[PDB]
Nucleic acid binder design. Structure first.
Ligand SMILES: [Mg+2]
Ligand SMILES: [Mg+2]
Ligand SMILES: [Mg+2]
Ligand SMILES: [Mg+2]
Ligand SMILES: [Mg+2]
Ligand SMILES: [Mg+2]
Ligand SMILES: [Mg+2]
Ligand SMILES: [Mg+2]
Ligand SMILES: [Mg+2]
Ligand SMILES: [Mg+2]
Ligand SMILES: [Mg+2]
Ligand SMILES: [Mg+2]
Ligand SMILES: [Mg+2]
Ligand SMILES: [Mg+2]
Ligand SMILES: [Mg+2]
Ligand SMILES: [Mg+2]
Ligand SMILES: [Mg+2]
Ligand SMILES: [Mg+2]
Ligand SMILES: [Mg+2]
Ligand SMILES: [Mg+2]
Ligand SMILES: [Mg+2]
Ligand SMILES: [Mg+2]
Ligand SMILES: [Mg+2]
Ligand SMILES: [Mg+2]
Ligand SMILES: [Mg+2]
Ligand SMILES: [Mg+2]
Ligand SMILES: [Mg+2]
Ligand SMILES: [Mg+2]
Ligand SMILES: [Mg+2]
Ligand SMILES: [Mg+2]
Ligand SMILES: [Mg+2]
Ligand SMILES: [Mg+2]
Ligand SMILES: [Mg+2]
Ligand SMILES: [Mg+2]
Ligand SMILES: [Mg+2]
Ligand SMILES: [Mg+2]
Ligand SMILES: [Mg+2]
Ligand SMILES: [Mg+2]
Ligand SMILES: [Mg+2]
Ligand SMILES: [Mg+2]
Ligand SMILES: [Mg+2]
Ligand SMILES: [Mg+2]
Ligand SMILES: [Mg+2]
Ligand SMILES: [Mg+2]
Ligand SMILES: [Mg+2]
Ligand SMILES: [Mg+2]
Ligand SMILES: [Mg+2]
Ligand SMILES: [Mg+2]
Ligand SMILES: [Mg+2]
Ligand SMILES: [Mg+2]
Ligand SMILES: [Mg+2]
Ligand SMILES: [Mg+2]
Ligand SMILES: [Mg+2]
Ligand SMILES: [Mg+2]
Ligand SMILES: [Mg+2]
Ligand SMILES: [Mg+2]
Ligand SMILES: [Mg+2]
Ligand SMILES: [Mg+2]
Ligand SMILES: [Mg+2]
Ligand SMILES: [Mg+2]
Ligand SMILES: [Mg+2]
Ligand SMILES: [Zn+2]
Lengths: 206, 60, 117, 127, 155, 24, 98
RNA sequence: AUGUGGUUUAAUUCGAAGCAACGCGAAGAACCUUACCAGGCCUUGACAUGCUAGGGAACCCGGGUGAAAGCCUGGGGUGCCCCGCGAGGGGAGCCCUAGCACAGGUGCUGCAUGGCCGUCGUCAGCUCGUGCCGUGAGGUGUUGGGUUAAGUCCCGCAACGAGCGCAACCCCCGCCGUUAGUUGCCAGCGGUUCGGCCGGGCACUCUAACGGGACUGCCCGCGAAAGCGGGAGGAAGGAGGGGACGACGUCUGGUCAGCAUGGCCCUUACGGCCUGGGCGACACACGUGCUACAAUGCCCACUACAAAGCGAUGCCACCCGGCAACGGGGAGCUAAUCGCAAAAAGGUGGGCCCAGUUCGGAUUGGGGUCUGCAACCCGACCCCAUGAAGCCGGAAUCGCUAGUAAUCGCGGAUCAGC
RNA sequence: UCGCUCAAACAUUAAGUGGUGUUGUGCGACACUUA
């Protein structure tokens, strides 16, 4: 099929830029370039607590690196040491005024990227690939959502021929704009290859 | 020669007519926009993600 | 309810069309939200589709039945005409009479004689 | 006193300042028969005036900009209409059935991708 | 299309005489969408009309298109697996279409240098009863009466 | 001729000016 | 006398910050010409979808770079402090000159 | 002109293979890009982490041989922390040489894969829940009658609802106003250099932003319902035109050369560097295109009307040289107000006179300009000359239903230039 | 300008086979199939 990326589809209306800020035609590249390496370093030494929406804001030497996480208890350590040394390594290679505004997540089950990375990991840890998707979608709908959808793809378990396991419930009108459906991609390293993950959570309306 | 070339692209030892464009993200050799400094591929990838500020889906 | 302010003309008439058809068939069934202790019918043959349901659900079967019928598959039979408003009226009246007579306050039968002609 | 109306077609706008008088018609300077030369659509733009039965009795002054040469003419055609109908409610009861009050939605469409001209696709082949 | 008949394109009446048939002729003349060019080219011949004969270009145009209006034509049709050249009446519109069309072509056939003089002389021979376009009309009508045998399938 | 290397539209199509084409 | 430029991307954020300045300058000083929208310079970028060969079905984006202009006349000392303190920009790179 | 098959070559890199490969990956092959060859060189490496050992400030200039890479070498120099006024020692940053773990691979496998894309096709479809029928595969619903762009809606119906699709919410052009006034107005008045140039103004044009509006709403006729046809008002009627949006899936489709990636294979070379050559080869064939084979026209002088876009190491108005490309002097520009810019076709006037032609510019000789270390291979562009094939084309075959086709100019991306 | 045989190249096919269709050599005046 096709199915253009739902996020790029709601880009204008529903959800706004995962990275919001202005730039002149002079250095847009260099700005977004460093803006990129930032979020990459975060995805690395921060995935522990399970980060998702790495929001960013810039204008002039100011950069609000708001990082949404399932449990900030790990991103801060104790009193203020983990978070502090994080701002350290941040501006350590950069030059802008780093300002890590951490924020919790009301419910990881209703946060698609988390839901994905979650189950995607279960597969890496060798688990029931079929029912893992079943519980995941059951977790989200029973949680409080109004629509759910999860899809893995690749060598399920380790079979030669490829395969794709479809599973979902509720509604997921991907063709509609006023839906506010969070997208949740995720990798999955296996001793036998790669493995794709998808996750759709319908929530908002009007 | 993929790794040694992305490094040589940033070298510019001799004359300027060797400092050819080179995508930053996936380090593509062609289709590199100068404005973004990216290849057409990774460009679209990010655009769907929303990591490209002001870059909205064109419709007219 | 004061909630009619929203809902465009589209959903209005459609939702009204809902109520219309909803009452068009359900009017007379919604009054009870449990499985009837029994069933009464005008012609076991025609509506035997329901008779089966009740039958398979062990629900006792009573119904007025003309010669064009299947006696054995009815628990408590009501032999006699059925394709005539005259015969149907006399039975339904006297039947429901036993309902209110075992209930309380025996009233006068509903205005049926006028509708008959 | 004056009769005003707005003209527009293919992004070719045209203000219409009309003042009852002779027949002298100025549009962005120059004369009407002067600016439009060798074009039959010219006398057609004055069609609203022939419908009202007052050709030589009105001094026109129009500010038409943008668009093409002819798109302006169609802008003038609808502009004069709104002008004379502005001070005449009864002249709408005979200018409308004759078809005059319409922006003419007919406009060039976007050249689609993959195609060549919004519709004309490159020569299909299989050889 | 398979559904609707698709209605004709009601064209704009003449801007000099007041007749749809005349404007339609301009369109057939119109090369590369130059109406104003073809319009003049048509009115050029109208003046060549009054030059030769003291006759109005209006009726000289009607008489020409009328004498080149094909009354009947042969159409191909399948039957079990065979093509018959069945003759039959044409539609009023199609007659006007072909007539106007052939005339334009007949002008192109002429050795005349200027386009206006080609349409001029051709409009004469057409209104008369013998011209390049008219002879192409007489020709098509022959095919009709010739295959009059297969006219049994009027359909 | 949109291909004549020495004409009005000859340079207009090639996006140039030159002699035969007016230039400042 | 003074002229302010309000370049930026999102017109929703540009409208909030442009309207904010108009209230703060007029409600505490001389006259001020309201928000003057300019021709939005847009960067339309077209490109192909698939990685390999697919000279069709291609996708394209556009960079909406808005423009808004606001002129304050009399150099009020209240308006200078008002705009210096009561401001809530973000992705709106403003530039002001006399 | 360009891609392709084929052939040729030391190499003429590889991929896509009916539709759905062939102006396609390429939105920029002169060395670069570059993955192929020849030759000259390096080989713990151009790049990531880390370890044992000698010496050393991190840093900068030149010389011999050479095509360059590189190979041999000489010179100027001596910061910071811990102990002392000095010597001397260790560490971090960084390097050479030797050695270990290891790097790197455009080398296979797209039937090992993720991701992304084409496709049937925006076609009208595909399913789930329970109930009911069948021993069961499965059926029913979704069938039927009317209608519709549509599984759209209506009526009927052992079925009753729902979900993924269709529609709708998203933007442009369509009518007008609201908000703002350095876009525009002899419109209304004063100077007139008779140029909206100055004063002034925003109603009107515009520049963008918000909102209303069209809903089978009205009437007539058919109809049970849904709905169709005709007429008015209206900027616009039955989705108004266009775009974004392309389901369960199929094509064991495509892509390991975008990238990530399981496994296999190379590891003084399947890795690295340079120079030159080669994707540009030519007895041939096919696809997609430009321009013509002309008098609705060719050469030329004057005049007028666009939309959108781009412009600091870039767009170039004014003046001079020459036939000109082009060069030089030099003003303005973080860009509705400076430049690219004359839009072309078209309107008036002139030669032309049916001729391989004032049509047609392909080919080839000589002389110039631009960019770049470098235009033989292999760039573009002037000027003078040579003025070829070529009379609207066989069998076959493509596009397109209206502001469409056809036809005529303009802009950008890419980009040293092309 | 026509009638005819034969050997290429191209077109119809999804592809092959065959055939069919045009231009090239010398003279006389669609059907079938597809490990
Ligand atoms: Mg679990
Ligand atoms: Mg990367
Ligand atoms: Mg009763
Ligand atoms: Mg009309
Ligand atoms: Mg067009
Ligand atoms: Mg338009
Ligand atoms: Mg358009
Ligand atoms: Mg031509
Ligand atoms: Mg140009
Ligand atoms: Mg000069
Ligand atoms: Mg090949
Ligand atoms: Mg390969
Ligand atoms: Mg294949
Ligand atoms: Mg070798
Ligand atoms: Mg290291
Ligand atoms: Mg030393
Ligand atoms: Mg030292
Ligand atoms: Mg040396
Ligand atoms: Mg020394
Ligand atoms: Mg040391
Ligand atoms: Mg290895
Ligand atoms: Mg595949
Ligand atoms: Mg795949
Ligand atoms: Mg393949
Ligand atoms: Mg059973
Ligand atoms: Mg049995
Ligand atoms: Mg079933
Ligand atoms: Mg079925
Ligand atoms: Mg206002
Ligand atoms: Mg106004
Ligand atoms: Mg109604
Ligand atoms: Mg009503
Ligand atoms: Mg009536
Ligand atoms: Mg109705
Ligand atoms: Mg009705
Ligand atoms: Mg009407
Ligand atoms: Mg009305
Ligand atoms: Mg309708
Ligand atoms: Mg849709
Ligand atoms: Mg691999
Ligand atoms: Mg790996
Ligand atoms: Mg070896
Ligand atoms: Mg102009
Ligand atoms: Mg625009
Ligand atoms: Mg440019
Ligand atoms: Mg200059
Ligand atoms: Mg400026
Ligand atoms: Mg200009
Ligand atoms: Mg002319
Ligand atoms: Mg000649
Ligand atoms: Mg010549
Ligand atoms: Mg050369
Ligand atoms: Mg013809
Ligand atoms: Mg033939
Ligand atoms: Mg450039
Ligand atoms: Mg033959
Ligand atoms: Mg031979
Ligand atoms: Mg012989
Ligand atoms: Mg003979
Ligand atoms: Mg046969
Ligand atoms: Mg056989
Ligand atoms: Zn890239």
């Amino acid at each position: 099929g096709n199915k253009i990326h739902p996020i790029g589809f709601r880009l204008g209306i529903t959800r706004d830029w995962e990275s919001r800020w202005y730039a002149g035609k002079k250095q847009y590249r260099h700005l977004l370039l460093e803006d990129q390496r930032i979020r990459g370093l975060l995805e690395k030494e921060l995935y522990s607590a399970g980060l998702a929406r790495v929001d960013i804001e810039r204008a002039a030497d100011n950069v609000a690196v708001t990082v949404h996480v399932a449990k900030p208890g790990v991103v801060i350590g104790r009193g203020g040491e983990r978070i502090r040394v994080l701002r350290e390594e941040l501006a350590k290679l950069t030059g802008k005024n780093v300002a890590l505004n951490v924020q919790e997540v009301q419910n990881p089950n209703l946060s698609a990227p988390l839901v994905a990375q979650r189950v995607a990991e279960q597969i890496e840890r060798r688990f029931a690939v079929r029912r893992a998707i079943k519980q995941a979608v059951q977790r989200v709908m029973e949680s409080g959502a109004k629509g759910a959808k999860v899809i893995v793809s690749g060598r399920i378990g380790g079979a030669e021929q490829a395969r794709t396991e479809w599973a979902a419930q509720g509604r997921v009108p991907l063709h509609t704009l006023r839906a506010n459906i969070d997208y949740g991609f995720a990798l999955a390293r296996t001793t036998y290859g790669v493995l794709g993950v998808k996750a759709y959570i319908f929530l908002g309306e009007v | 020669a993929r790794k040694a070339l992305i490094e040589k692209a940033k070298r510019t030892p001799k004359f300027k007519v060797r400092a050819y464009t080179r995508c930053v993200r996936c380090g593509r050799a062609r289709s590199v926009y100068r404005f973004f400094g990216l290849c057409r591929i990774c460009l679209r990838e990010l655009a769907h993600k929303g990591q490209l500020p002001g870059v909205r889906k064109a419709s007219w | 309810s004061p909630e009619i302010e929203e809902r465009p003309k589209k959903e209005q008439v459609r939702l009204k069309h809902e109520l219309e058809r909803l009452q068009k068939y359900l009017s007379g069934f919604r009054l009870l939200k449990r499985l009837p202790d029994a069933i009464f019918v005008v012609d076991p043959t025609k509506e035997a589709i329901a008779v089966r349901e009740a039958r398979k659900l062990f629900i006792p079967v009573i119904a007025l039945a003309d010669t064009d019928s299947d006696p054995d598959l009815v628990d408590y039979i009501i032999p006699g005409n059925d394709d005539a408003i005259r015969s149907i009226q006399l039975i339904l009246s006297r039947a429901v009479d036993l309902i209110i007579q075992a209930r309380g306050g025996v009233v006068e039968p509903s205005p049926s004689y006028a509708l008959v002609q | 006193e004056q009769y005003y109306g707005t003209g527009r077609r293919k992004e070719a706008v045209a203000r219409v300042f009309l003042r009852p008088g002779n027949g002298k018609v100025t549009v962005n300077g120059q004369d009407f028969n002067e600016y439009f030369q060798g074009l039959v659509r010219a006398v057609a733009a004055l069609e609203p005036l022939r419908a009202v039965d007052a050709l030589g009795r009105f001094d026109a002054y129009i500010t038409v900009r943008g668009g093409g040469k002819s798109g302006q003419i169609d802008a003038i055609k609808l502009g004069i209409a709104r002008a004379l109908v502005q001070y005449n409610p009864d002249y709408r009861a005979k200018l409308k059935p004759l078809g005059f009050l319409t922006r003419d939605a007919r406009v060039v469409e976007r050249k689609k991708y993959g195609k060549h001209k919004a519709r004309r696709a490159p020569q299909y082949s299989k050889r | 299309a398979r559904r609707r008949r698709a209605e004709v394109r009601q064209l704009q009446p003449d801007l000099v005489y007041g007749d749809v048939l005349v404007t339609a002729f301009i369109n057939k003349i119109m090369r590369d969408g130059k109406k104003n060019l073809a319009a003049r080219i048509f009115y050029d011949a109208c003046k060549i009309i009054q030059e030769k004969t003291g006759q109005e270009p209006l009726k000289v145009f009607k008489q020409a298109v009328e004498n080149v209006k094909p009354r009947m034509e042969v159409r191909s049709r399948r039957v079990g697996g065979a093509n018959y050249q069945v003759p039959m009446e044409v539609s009023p519109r199609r007659q006007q279409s072909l007539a106007l069309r052939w005339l334009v072509q007949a002008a192109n056939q002429r050795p005349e240098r200027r386009a206006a003089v080609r349409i001029a002389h051709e409009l004469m021979d057409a209104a008369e009863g013998k011209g390049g376009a008219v002879k192409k009309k007489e020709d098509v009508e022959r095919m009709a009466e010739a295959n009059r045998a297969y006219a049994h399938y009027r359909w | 001729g949109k291909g004549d290397r020495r004409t009005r539209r000859g340079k207009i199509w090639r996006g140039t000016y030159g002699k035969y084409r007016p230039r400042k | 006398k003074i002229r302010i430029k309000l370049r930026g991307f999102d017109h929703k954020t540009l409208d909030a910050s442009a309207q904010k300045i108009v209230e703060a300058a007029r409600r505490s000083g001389a006259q001020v010409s309201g928000p003057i929208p300019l021709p939005t310079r847009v960067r339309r970028f077209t490109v192909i979808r698939g990685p390999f060969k697919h000279k069709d079905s291609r996708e394209h984006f556009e960079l909406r770079t808005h423009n808004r202009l606001v002129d304050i006349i009399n150099p009020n000392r209240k308006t200078i402090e008002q705009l210096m303190t009561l401001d809530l920009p973000t992705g709106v790179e403003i530039e002001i000159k006399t």
